[PDB]
Amino acid sequence: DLSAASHRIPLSDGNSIPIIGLGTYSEPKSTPKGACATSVKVAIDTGYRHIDGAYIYQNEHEVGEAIREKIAEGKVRREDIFYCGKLWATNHVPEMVRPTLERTLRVLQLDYVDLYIIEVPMAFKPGDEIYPRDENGKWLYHKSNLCATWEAMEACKDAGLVKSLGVSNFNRRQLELILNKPGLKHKPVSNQVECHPYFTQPKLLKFCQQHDIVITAYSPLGTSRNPIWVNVSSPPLLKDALLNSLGKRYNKTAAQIVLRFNIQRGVVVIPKSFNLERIKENFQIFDFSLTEEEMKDIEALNKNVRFVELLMWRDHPEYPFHDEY
Numbered sequence: 020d021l022s023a024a025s026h027r028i029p030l031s032d033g034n035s036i037p038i039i040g041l042g043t044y045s046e047p048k049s050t051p052k053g054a055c056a057t058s059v060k061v062a063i064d065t066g067y068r069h070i071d072g073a074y075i076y077q078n079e080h081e082v083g084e085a086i087r088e089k090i091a092e093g094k095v096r097r098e099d100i101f102y103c104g105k106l107w108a109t110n111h112v113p114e115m116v117r118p119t120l121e122r123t124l125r126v127l128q129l130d131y132v133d134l135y136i137i138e139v140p141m142a143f144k145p146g147d148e149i150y151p152r153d154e155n156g157k158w159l160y161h162k163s164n165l166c167a168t169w170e171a172m173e174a175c176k177d178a179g180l181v182k183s184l185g186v187s188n189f190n191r192r193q194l195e196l197i198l199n200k201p202g203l204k205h206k207p208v209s210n211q212v213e214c215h216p217y218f219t220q221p222k223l224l225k226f227c228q229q230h231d232i233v234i235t236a237y238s239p240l241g242t243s244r245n246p247i248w249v250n251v252s253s254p255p256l257l258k259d260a261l262l263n264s265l266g267k268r269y270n271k272t273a274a275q276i277v278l279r280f281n282i283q284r285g286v287v288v289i290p291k292s293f294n295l296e297r298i299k300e301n302f303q304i305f306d307f308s309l310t311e312e313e314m315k316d317i318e319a320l321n322k323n324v325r326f327v328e329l330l331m332w333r334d335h336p337e338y339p340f341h342d343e344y
């Protein structure tokens with residue numbers, strides 16, 4: 020059973036993960052400096068012990084600032100905090116994996132991260148530019164080799180630089196390539212995918228459960244609806260009639276119902292908010308539960324429509340979303 024004070028769930032490698040985390044993507048060009056750092060401090064104060072970030076969000080140093088300040092004020096110990104970082108597509112070449120993680124440790128000013136994941140299964144041309152395209156707008160890809168990249172990840176774990184290893188945006192075929200690798204040393208413990216009542220991931224979730232992989236739900240509130248990335252043809256999740264009526268049964272908001280839904284089925288949720296009130300709101304999901312009927316009601320909202328389709332990379336040989344799951 021899950022409580023505000025105790026809500027970690029086991030990972031297959033013997034580690035554990037707080038089932039709610041603070042998401043920290045925020046559009047760089049429109050986000051004030053300091054907003055992430057403040058939000059992470061507010062979150063930790065509120066009771067969050069998990070923060071999800073990425074070097075390419077351009078605010079990973081702010082996460083470190085926040086975490087190190089709360090440690091310094093003896094609010095938490097490093098051991099109490101779970102940070103997840105990610106290896107971007109431009110950094111999949113095996114010899115670049117460790118230097119890339121070390122860059123994030125410098126940025127964080129921390130000695131290890133709790134979870135390091137392959138951010139997408141697609142390899143992009145190495146370089147500073149996170150979204151490399153040539154003069155004719157053609158995407159500059161690299162040939163993926165998930166097993167060789169995974170081997171470099173394993174070596175980072177053996178060097179003490181990360182406690183747990185995982186993936187993100189992997190489909191079943193891509194998981195199976197790693198799970199079936201000869202000489203596999205560390206199985207992936209986590210797969211971070213989009214997941215919410217309009218995209219409940221029934222087949223992928225079940226597959227991961229069968230392999231002792233925990234799913235982390237990104238965009239668990241249905242995203243910030245940024246038209247650069249988001250399928251806005253889908254309606255806003257938090258305006259869903261049913262979720263809002265379900266919220267009235269418990270004096271909860273649609274967001275609180277949506278987060279409770281996923282954590283209740285052992286899915287980790289990493290809602291992003293840089294708003295003081297909503298950071299708190301999002302954490303108040305341990306003082307109620309959904310009935311089994313309500314869990315079925317919400318599952319039935321599944322449209323099998325993703326808000327985050329990544330359509331610009333549909334031609335990459337390892338584009339994950341052509342397969343059924």
Ligand SMILES: NC(=O)c1ccc[n+]([C@@H]2O[C@H](COP(=O)([O-])OP(=O)(O)OC[C@H]3O[C@@H](n4cnc5c(N)ncnc54)[C@H](OP(=O)(O)O)[C@@H]3O)[C@@H](O)[C@H]2O)c1
Nearest residue numbers: 042043044237238239240241242243274290291292293294
């Ligand atoms: N691995 C990947 O490929 C990947 C991809 C996308 C995202 N992620 C991760 O997952 C995290 C979460 O997803 P996301 O940021 O896309 O989306 P999200 O968490 O689903 O929701 C984001 C939006 O919800 C708003 N919001 C937050 N709490 C709310 C509440 N209680 N009521 C109404 N509105 C609320 C936020 O605005 P305010 O900030 O103003 O509250 C923001 O506009 C990211 O921040 C990132 O850490 C991973």
